[PDB]
Amino acid sequence: AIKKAHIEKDFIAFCSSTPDNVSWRHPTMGSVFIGRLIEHMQEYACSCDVEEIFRKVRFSFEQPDGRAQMPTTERVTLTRCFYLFPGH
Amino acid sequence: AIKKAHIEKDFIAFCSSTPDNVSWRHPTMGSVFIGRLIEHMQEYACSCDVEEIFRKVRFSFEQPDGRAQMPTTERVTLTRCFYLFPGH
Amino acid sequence: MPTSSGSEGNVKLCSLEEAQRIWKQKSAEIYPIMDKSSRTRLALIICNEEFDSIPRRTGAEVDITGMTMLLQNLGYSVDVKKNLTASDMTTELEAFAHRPEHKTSDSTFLVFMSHGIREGICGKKHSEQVPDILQLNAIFNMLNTKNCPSLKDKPKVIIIQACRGDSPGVVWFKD
Amino acid sequence: MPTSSGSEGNVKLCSLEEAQRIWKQKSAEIYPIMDKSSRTRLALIICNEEFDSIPRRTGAEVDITGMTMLLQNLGYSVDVKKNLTASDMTTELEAFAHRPEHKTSDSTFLVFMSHGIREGICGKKHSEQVPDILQLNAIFNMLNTKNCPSLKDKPKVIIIQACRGDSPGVVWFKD
Numbered sequence: 298a299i300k301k302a303h304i305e306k307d308f309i310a311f312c313s314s315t316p317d318n319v320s321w322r323h324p325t326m327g328s329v330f331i332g333r334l335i336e337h338m339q340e341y342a343c344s345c346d347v348e349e350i351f352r353k354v355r356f357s358f359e360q361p362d363g364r365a366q367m368p369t370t371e372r373v374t375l376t377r378c379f380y381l382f383p384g385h
Numbered sequence: 386a387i388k389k390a391h392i393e394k395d396f397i398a399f400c401s402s403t404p405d406n407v408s409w410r411h412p413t414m415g416s417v418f419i420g421r422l423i424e425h426m427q428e429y430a431c432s433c434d435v436e437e438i439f440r441k442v443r444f445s446f447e448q449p450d451g452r453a454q455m456p457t458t459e460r461v462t463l464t465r466c467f468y469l470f471p472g473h
Numbered sequence: 474m475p476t477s478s479g480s481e482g483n484v485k486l487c488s489l490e491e492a493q494r495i496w497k498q499k500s501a502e503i504y505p506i507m508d509k510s511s512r513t514r515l516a517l518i519i520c521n522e523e524f525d526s527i528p529r530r531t532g533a534e535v536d537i538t539g540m541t542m543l544l545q546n547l548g549y550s551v552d553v554k555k556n557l558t559a560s561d562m563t564t565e566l567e568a569f570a571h572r573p574e575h576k577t578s579d580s581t582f583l584v585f586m587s588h589g590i591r592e593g594i595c596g597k598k599h600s601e602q603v604p605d606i607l608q609l610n611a612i613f614n615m616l617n618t619k620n621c622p623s624l625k626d627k628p629k630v631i632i633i634q635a636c637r638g639d640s641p642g643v644v645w646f647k648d
Numbered sequence: 649m650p651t652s653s654g655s656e657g658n659v660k661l662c663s664l665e666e667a668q669r670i671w672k673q674k675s676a677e678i679y680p681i682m683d684k685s686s687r688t689r690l691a692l693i694i695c696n697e698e699f700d701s702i703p704r705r706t707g708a709e710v711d712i713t714g715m716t717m718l719l720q721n722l723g724y725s726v727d728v729k730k731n732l733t734a735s736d737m738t739t740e741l742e743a744f745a746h747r748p749e750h751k752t753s754d755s756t757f758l759v760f761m762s763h764g765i766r767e768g769i770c771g772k773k774h775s776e777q778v779p780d781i782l783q784l785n786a787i788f789n790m791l792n793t794k795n796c797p798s799l800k801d802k803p804k805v806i807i808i809q810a811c812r813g814d815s816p817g818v819v820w821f822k823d
């Protein structure tokens with residue numbers, strides 16, 4: 298017996314900036330977005346679902362300096378919370 | 386004194402289906418997505434932030450029937466949780 | 474006994490304890506809510522039902538009724554606009570972003586209900602030969618900090634009821 | 649004393665109590681996690697550093713190191729691909745969606761790090777006259793249920809480090 302499934306589901310995109318805008322990068326330190334994401338994953342993977350973590354990264358960019366960017370969550374079809382449960 | 390602000394921030398789009406796909410509508414009952422959103426807002430506005438509510442609507446569409454669709458959250462730049470606090 | 478006779482209607486209320494629990498469980502990571510007595514919350518509904526060439530969206534009136542009442546229950550003054558071209562929609566959106574009440578508001582809801590193709594939302598004058606489309610990108614640009622400073626740092630919720638192409642959105646699998 | 653000498657490195661661990669608390673606070677609204685002893689988790693990193701015409705992405709190696717280690721800490725086997733055209737990226741993505749390990753996995757991470765314009769991610773051969781672009785839409789299509797049934801009902805996280813245009817993304821306001 299064949300059953301129907303949604304063609305597109307359980308996706309989440311996380312971009313480094315909003316449309317039209319640049320994302321910043323340090324020659325020895327890497328990308329600002331990537332570095333911030335590693336920090337937040339490391340700290341919050343154990344307590345938050347990935348959508349929450351992405352918001353916290355965004356919040357961490359809330360106060361703009363000379364090199365401002367605002368990471369964007371896109372095309373979200375997560376029906377559930379995704380907890381990484383690091384250590385498990 | 387002038388200060389910098391992100392050009393795009395604190396946005397959330399909620400579409401009725403995923404790209405390429407149709408959204409269903411009943412001639413006397415209205416749109417399936419709209420009806421489901423009203424239900425979930427009515428029940429969950431008091432306990433969840435709007436991002437959570439949108440996920441629950443999505444989850445409610447998880448099991449496809451003859452008229453299947455998967456609502457999509459798009460272009461999210463919310464840095465905080467948005468609670469409606471109905472009654473306040 | 475809870476009652477739908479009140480201004481919040483069928484929307485379940487958030488108790489004073491619930492509001493305090495949420496304000497504790499999550500820190501300064503909640504959007505600030507403005508004083509109820511003085512806030513001028515705005516919402517806009519653009520719904521297209523009658524179209525020149527494409528079929529009539531029967532049932533759209535039930536959608537308008539429900540969405541208008543729900544945003545009101547949540548505290549928003551609801552503007553309802555009907556059967557507009559992509560040009561009219563832009564003009565109306567611009568007018569919305571220029572409303573003084575956004576200054577004394579904490580949030581906004583934008584609702585678009587219409588036909589839709591892959592590229593965006595359909596105006597009343599839409600056909601294959603002469604497209605009448607409002608891009609989602611355009612809505613965002615008009616409500617962003619450049620074009621709507623009054624809504625700076627404030628949640629802007631955009632809701633779209635529309636098709637995004639002709640496909641049923643499904644694939645078969647066997648158990 | 650917690651230690652980064654373990655396989656999870658600098659990633660803070662989730663205690664057995666924490667895992668049980670989350671499994672209670674949120675109901676059957678969490679994605680199922682597969683048995684650690686038998687799961688074959690996969691992740692893919694496509695990073696472009698050297699480009700034919702557009703400037704070299706100095707620091708990209710620090711990004712590869714960090715992302716590769718982080719996905720490993722989280723339990724994913726990380727495939728690292730470098731300096732690819734939009735055509736190569738498509739081919740590699742197709743190859744990723746065809747990996748048998750997705751059958752015995754619970755989730756996937758896709759990471760794209762490159763230059764980028766409004767329309768998508770830049771391949772190594774990108775210039776203004778001859779664009780070499782991978783659209784975000786294309787990534788999604790290749791990992792969706794039609795083209796990747798093995799990942800049906802499983803979280804697919806896509807991460808993009810790229811510009812999306814030339815603008816600084818800021819507007820001035822006075823206090």
Ligand SMILES: *C(=O)[C@H](CC(=O)O)NC(=O)c1ccc(CNC(=O)c2ccc(Nc3cnc4ccccc4n3)cc2)nc1
Pocket residue numbers: 407408409410411412414415416417418420421452530587588589590634635636637
């Ligand atoms: C595409 O652009 C548009 C999008 C739009 O107008 O919103 N979609 C369509 O043009 C469209 C064409 C045909 C149909 C046919 N609808 C159905 O097949 C249908 C069958 C059953 C139901 N049942 C139902 C039951 N209960 C409820 C409760 C609340 C709301 C809706 C509801 N529906 C619905 C639709 N649809 C769209």
Ligand SMILES: *C(=O)[C@H](CC(=O)O)NC(=O)c1ccc(CNC(=O)c2ccc(Nc3cnc4ccccc4n3)cc2)nc1
Pocket residue numbers: 319320321322323324326327328329330332333364705762763764765809810811812
């Ligand atoms: C556009 O397509 C690309 C996107 C990409 O390659 O990722 N962006 C660029 O081409 C680009 C051009 C120039 C620059 C200049 N960078 C900076 O101005 C810059 C200054 C300071 C810092 N500081 C800093 C401090 N600490 C950290 C920690 C961790 C990671 C980064 C970091 N950065 C960074 C960048 N950028 C991009």
